[PDB]
Amino acid sequence: EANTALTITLSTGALLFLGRFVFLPFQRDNVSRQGLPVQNGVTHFDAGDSRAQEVTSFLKTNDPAGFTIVDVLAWGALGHAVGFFILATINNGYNPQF
Amino acid sequence: DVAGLTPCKESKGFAKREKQEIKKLESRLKLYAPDSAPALALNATIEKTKRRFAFYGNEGLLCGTDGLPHLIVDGDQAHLGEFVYPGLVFLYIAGWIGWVGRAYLIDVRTSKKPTEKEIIIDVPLALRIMSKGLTWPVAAIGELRSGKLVEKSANITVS
Amino acid sequence: TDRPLWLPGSEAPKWLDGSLPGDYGFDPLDLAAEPGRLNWMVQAELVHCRWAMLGAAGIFIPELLTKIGILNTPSWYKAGDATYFADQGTLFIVELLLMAWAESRRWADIARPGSVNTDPIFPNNKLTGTDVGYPGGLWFDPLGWGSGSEDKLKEIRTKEVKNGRLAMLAVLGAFVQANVTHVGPIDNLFAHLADPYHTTILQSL
Amino acid sequence: AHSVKIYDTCIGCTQCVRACPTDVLEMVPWDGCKASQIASAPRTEDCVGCKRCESACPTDFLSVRVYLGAETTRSMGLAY
Amino acid sequence: GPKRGSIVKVLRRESYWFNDTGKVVAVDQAPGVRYPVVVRFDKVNYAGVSTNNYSPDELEAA
Amino acid sequence: EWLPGNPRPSYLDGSAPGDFGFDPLGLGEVPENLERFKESELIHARWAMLAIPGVLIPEALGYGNWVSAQKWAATPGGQATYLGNPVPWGNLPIILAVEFIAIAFVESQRNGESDPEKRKYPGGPFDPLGFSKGANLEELKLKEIKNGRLALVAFLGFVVQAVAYPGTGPLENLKTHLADPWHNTIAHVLIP
Amino acid sequence: MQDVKTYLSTAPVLATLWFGFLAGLLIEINRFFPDALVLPL
Ligand SMILES: CC(/C=C/C=C(C)/C=C/[C@@]12O[C@]1(C)C[C@@H](O)CC2(C)C)=C\C=C\C=C(C)\C=C\C=C(C)\C=C\[C@@]12O[C@]1(C)C[C@@H](O)CC2(C)C
Numbered sequence: 156e157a158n159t160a161l162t163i164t165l166s167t168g169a170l171l172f173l174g175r176f177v178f179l180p181f182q183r184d185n186v187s188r189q190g191l192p193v194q195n196g197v198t199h200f201d202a203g204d205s206r207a208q209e210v211t212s213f214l215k216t217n218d219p220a221g222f223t224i225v226d227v228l229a230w231g232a233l234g235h236a237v238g239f240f241i242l243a244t245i246n247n248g249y250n251p252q253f
Numbered sequence: 254d255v256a257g258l259t260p261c262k263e264s265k266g267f268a269k270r271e272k273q274e275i276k277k278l279e280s281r282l283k284l285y286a287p288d289s290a291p292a293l294a295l296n297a298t299i300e301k302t303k304r305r306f307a308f309y310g311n312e313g314l315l316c317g318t319d320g321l322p323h324l325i326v327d328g329d330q331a332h333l334g335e336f337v338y339p340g341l342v343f344l345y346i347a348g349w350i351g352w353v354g355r356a357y358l359i360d361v362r363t364s365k366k367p368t369e370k371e372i373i374i375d376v377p378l379a380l381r382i383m384s385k386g387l388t389w390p391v392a393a394i395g396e397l398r399s400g401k402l403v404e405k406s407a408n409i410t411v412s
Numbered sequence: 413t414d415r416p417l418w419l420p421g422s423e424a425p426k427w428l429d430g431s432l433p434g435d436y437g438f439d440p441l442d443l444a445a446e447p448g449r450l451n452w453m454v455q456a457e458l459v460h461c462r463w464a465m466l467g468a469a470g471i472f473i474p475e476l477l478t479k480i481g482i483l484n485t486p487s488w489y490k491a492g493d494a495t496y497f498a499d500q501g502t503l504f505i506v507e508l509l510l511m512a513w514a515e516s517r518r519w520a521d522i523a524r525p526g527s528v529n530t531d532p533i534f535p536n537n538k539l540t541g542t543d544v545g546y547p548g549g550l551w552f553d554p555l556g557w558g559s560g561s562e563d564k565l566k567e568i569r570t571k572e573v574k575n576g577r578l579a580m581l582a583v584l585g586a587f588v589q590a591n592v593t594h595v596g597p598i599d600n601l602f603a604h605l606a607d608p609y610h611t612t613i614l615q616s617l
Numbered sequence: 618a619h620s621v622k623i624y625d626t627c628i629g630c631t632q633c634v635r636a637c638p639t640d641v642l643e644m645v646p647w648d649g650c651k652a653s654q655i656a657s658a659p660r661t662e663d664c665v666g667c668k669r670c671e672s673a674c675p676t677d678f679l680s681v682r683v684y685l686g687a688e689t690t691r692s693m694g695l696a697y
Numbered sequence: 698g699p700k701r702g703s704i705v706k707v708l709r710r711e712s713y714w715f716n717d718t719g720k721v722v723a724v725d726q727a728p729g730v731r732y733p734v735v736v737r738f739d740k741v742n743y744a745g746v747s748t749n750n751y752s753p754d755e756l757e758a759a
Numbered sequence: 760e761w762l763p764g765n766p767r768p769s770y771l772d773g774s775a776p777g778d779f780g781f782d783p784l785g786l787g788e789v790p791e792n793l794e795r796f797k798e799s800e801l802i803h804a805r806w807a808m809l810a811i812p813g814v815l816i817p818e819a820l821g822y823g824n825w826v827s828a829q830k831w832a833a834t835p836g837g838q839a840t841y842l843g844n845p846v847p848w849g850n851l852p853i854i855l856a857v858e859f860i861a862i863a864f865v866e867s868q869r870n871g872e873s874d875p876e877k878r879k880y881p882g883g884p885f886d887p888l889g890f891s892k893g894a895n896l897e898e899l900k901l902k903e904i905k906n907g908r909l910a911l912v913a914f915l916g917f918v919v920q921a922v923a924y925p926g927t928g929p930l931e932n933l934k935t936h937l938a939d940p941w942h943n944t945i946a947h948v949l950i951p
Numbered sequence: 952m953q954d955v956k957t958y959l960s961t962a963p964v965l966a967t968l969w970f971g972f973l974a975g976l977l978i979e980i981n982r983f984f985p986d987a988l989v990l991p992l
């Protein structure tokens with residue numbers, strides 16, 4: 156039996172810490188290099204896709220590191236997923252002797 | 254043994270097939286005079302069948318459920334004579350014929366009229382080239398390493 | 413000054429000019445026609461001659477002395493399957509490593525002549541050979557023979573290559589005779605001596 | 618309504634004009650070849666598409682080309 | 698252009714003898730000739746001819 | 760220099776530490792590839808050098824075989840026994856999580872380096888004794904790379920000898936070689 | 952006689968002679984070594 160609240164909390168905290176402090180420069184410069192989906196040398200919105208205008212009100216940040224709410228969602232989703240993976244693996248009841 | 258196949262000598266169905274064939278041949282034989290030519294021919298066929306079955310049984314061939322020999326070609330040391338040895342012999346012979354043909358073509362290419370020698374074969378030159386094909390692997394590796402086997406400037410179409 | 417040929421009335425191929433020892437103009441299949449191959453084939457023939465001479469002196473002489481009775485060595489074609497102080501596979505691996513070292517050094521000499529003439533550990537040794545395939549020096553030429561004027565080394569090198577060719581043929585014959593007639597070579601010689609017109613290769617085959 | 622084009626590799630041997638069964642081609646004075654003449658295709662409305670001109674042209678690749686297009690009662694070769 | 702008797706390689710891309718050697722026959726020295734060089738080959742093309750006219754910049758010195 | 764008299768490749772002049780012109784496959788022809796390969800060789804070699812003492816010392820002191828040392832995992836329970844004493848935090852999930860987080864942070868910190876020389880040889884906080892100040896850098900680098908290559912070969916030998924003789928360690932195989940050398944060798948595996 | 956030798960060197964005649972010799976050789980081999988399914992050596 157594994158504690159659900161404790162496991163999810165610890166896993167999500169670990170993933171959020173990794174995203175905020177460890178892998179943040181790598182994510183930032185890799186997304187800077189792969190800038191935007193571009194067709195014929197111009198972005199979709201500038202090519203004329205009105206539905207493809209980037210939302211910036213949903214990307215405003217106040218962290219010194221520029222950490223964004225979408226980043227929160229991504230790292231938290233990874234945290235919930237890893238926590239549930241650990242919970243299911245612990246409660247699986249499958250213990251093969253290797 | 255391999256893939257659940259039994260040896261031909263141990264197998265039943267191989268012997269059953271031999272018995273059936275011999276019985277059919279003797280049933281045919283029952284219609285002729287003992288000393289006539291058809292009787293001698295049928296007896297020769299019977300002896301040939303017996304010899305063939307004995308050789309197949311004694312050579313070490315695997316046998317299926319239906320009673321017929323099966324071949325193993327995965328490289329097994331106990332069944333090299335089934336595939337690997339005839340394959341090597343064929344590779345030698347085919348390389349010989351191909352190599353001597355290529356050599357004759359190359360030698361004819363520099364002539365007064367190559368097409369005439371292309372339809373009407375220069376028999377002495379052909380015989381010389383053909384006799385020099387015994388050691389074709391050595392010459393082939395020699396030209397492969399010497400850089401005189403492949404070409405680099407060949408005609409191609411609009412890419 | 414036309415040297416004798418393998419086939420009287422013929423003419424020697426262009427690449428075989430007559431300078432190499434044991435040159436009888438014999439190359440019907442043009443195996444050394446291209447300029448590069450001749451040196452490689454010369455080295456191969458030298459090493460084959462020497463290995464075959466060793467094999468002949470190790471096959472025929474022990475069998476002869478066993479037939480006389482001075483020694484008691486087993487037959488050559490079954491001496492591999494005996495009991496030794498070491499396992500057969502271990503001996504094979506050990507010889508692969510030692511021969512790897514020796515043959516790598518010989519290869520380095522063949523590719524770049526005069527490049528491995530010196531001892532890698534003690535640089536004061538410096539083998540004193542000049543011709544590829546004839547290393548010379550103290551290790552391989554102790555008594556100092558075979559270091560003389562040109563056309564004088566020709567005779568001794570021809571002697572070596574011809575005895576080696578004879579040894580090669582003898583060893584191949586010993587192999588095939590052992591395979592066919594499951595007896596040692598000396599007993600086969602005695603059989604051909606006693607009944608020459610019946611004990612031949614034809615046999616009852 | 619086929620289209621016939623002449624390219625500047627022409628040598629003016631006049632074989633295409635002689636081969637044409639409907640008098641589509643003709644020779645025109647030119648500079649750029651030893652014969653100093655080139656082929657022209659003014660009556661392309663009468664071309665049937667037989668490609669005899671292409672068969673008669675000596676050149677690595679053809680100096681006269683026929684591109685099949687819209688079909689007409691003259692192009693279809695109909696006598697009825 | 699190349700002198701008579703030269704061996705040249707065809708560089709015209711739609712030519713049948715592309716990357717093949719030729720034999721220069723005659724060069725026209727008139728100022729306005731567009732393909733003055735005449736080259737003869739060994740094998741015939743699909744149409745069955747073995748001679749063509751080429752520009753000096755569609756041939757190689759080898 | 761790896762083969763006496765052999766010509767040396769153009770890119771491998773002979774200035775880098777442990778450079779003997781050994782490159783039969785021509786994998787270092789691309790310059791950026793060569794720099795990456797230099798750094799990766801250093802990292803693989805340093806890891807092997809730091810590893811193999813932990814392969815030998817436990818077996819010498821017992822209670823360890825570097826393959827049975829991982830045996831407690833992949834077994835229900837047994838999350839204990841570092842040095843004959845149980846580990847209070849020996850559970851597999853916490854061990855895995857701690858190792859992943861710590862090594863990820865350390866390695867990402869390493870990855871944030873611009874100068875290739877500092878990529879290979881950081882210095883500073885990693886040289887408390889200042890060995891890199893005694894004007895013996897070339898010889899020290901040569902010694903490091905030579906011992907590291909030897910350690911890499913030794914660990915490959917460890918792995919292959921574990922494959923060939925399951926349930927045994929390196930020192931046990933050495934004692935087997937010493938017990939009867941001429942009938943206990945690689946011939947028993949290469950030649951069945 | 953030179954013309955006869957040239958005619959006998961044409962492709963169809965040489966092919967006929969070569970394939971006849973090859974077929975005869977194979978037929979004789981199968982007469983003396985019949986029913987050969989696997990190579991004994
Ligand atoms: C025959 C031979 C080669 C023959 C080649 C020929 C004819 C080539 C002829 C031609 O190419 C030419 C020249 C020119 C071409 O234009 C035409 C042809 C016609 C193609 C090599 C033998 C080579 C023979 C060799 C190398 C023999 C080595 C023997 C050894 C090592 C023996 C070891 C042991 O016998 C001991 C001592 C005792 C025990 O231990 C047991 C063992 C282990 C068996």
Ligand SMILES: CC1=C(/C=C/C(C)=C/C=C/C(C)=C/C=C/C=C(C)/C=C/C=C(C)/C=C/C2=C(C)CCCC2(C)C)C(C)(C)CCC1
Binds near residue numbers: 167230231237
């Ligand atoms: C402000 C601030 C702060 C704080 C912070 C915080 C508190 C944060 C948090 C955060 C968080 C806390 C987040 C989270 C998130 C989460 C998420 C986002 C999730 C998701 C999930 C999912 C997506 C899931 C899925 C699934 C399902 C549904 C089922 C099963 C399977 C799975 C798992 C897959 C501090 C103090 C530092 C200071 C500074 C400022």
Ligand code: SF4
Binds near residue numbers: 636640666667670671
């Ligand atoms: S396709 Fe026929 S009709 Fe048309 S131009 Fe050519 S020859 Fe004349």
Ligand code: SF4
Binds near residue numbers: 627675
């Ligand atoms: S056939 Fe070709 S080269 Fe001749 S005139 Fe017509 S288009 Fe010109």
